[PDB]
Amino acid sequence: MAHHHHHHMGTLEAQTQGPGSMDVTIYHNPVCGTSRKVLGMIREAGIEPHVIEYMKTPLPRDMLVELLRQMAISPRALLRAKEARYAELGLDDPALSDEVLIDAMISNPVLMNRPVVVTPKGVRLCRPAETVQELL
Numbered sequence: 001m002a003h004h005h006h007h008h009m010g011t012l013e014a015q016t017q018g019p020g021s022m023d024v025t026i027y028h029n030p031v032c033g034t035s036r037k038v039l040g041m042i043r044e045a046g047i048e049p050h051v052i053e054y055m056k057t058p059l060p061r062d063m064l065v066e067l068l069r070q071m072a073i074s075p076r077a078l079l080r081a082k083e084a085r086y087a088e089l090g091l092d093d094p095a096l097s098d099e100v101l102i103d104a105m106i107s108n109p110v111l112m113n114r115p116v117v118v119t120p121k122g123v124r125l126c127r128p129a130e131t132v133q134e135l136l
Contacts, residue, residue, distance in 0.1 A: 024049040028115035037129035
C-alpha cells in the first residue's frame with residue numbers, strides 16, 4: 001500500500017481552441033519541472049510560444065511595484081495564498097502600507113520577474129505555473 005485512492009481531476013471543465021497563426025512570446029530560461037509544467041499547459045491548450053533569450057535586467061522596487069500594481073491590483077492583494085510566507089510575515093495586516101508590502105516582496109523570491117509570458121490576450125508572469133495558468 002503505497003498509493004492512496006483519491007480522485008481530483010474530473011469535476012472541472014476546460015474550454016480553449018482556435019486556428020494557427022499563434023502570437024505568444026515567452027522570456028525566461030530552461031528549468032526542469034517548472035518549464036515542463038508551463039510547456040504542458042500551453043502545449044495542451046494549443047499554443048506555440050516563442051522561446052526568447054534576453055540578458056539579465058533586474059528592475060528597481062519602484063518599477064516592480066508599479067508594474068505589479070498597474071498589472072492587476074496593488075501589491076496588497078497580489079501575494080497569493082500559496083505564499084504562506086506572505087501571511088506568515090503578517091503582510092495581510094490591514095494596518096500596513098505599500099512601503100512594507102513592497103520591501104517584503106522585493107526581499108522574497110516572489111519578486112522573480114525574469115519569467116514573463118506575453119500573449120495576444122494580455123501579459124503576465126510566465127511563472128510560477130500558477131500565474132501562467134491563471135493568465136492562460
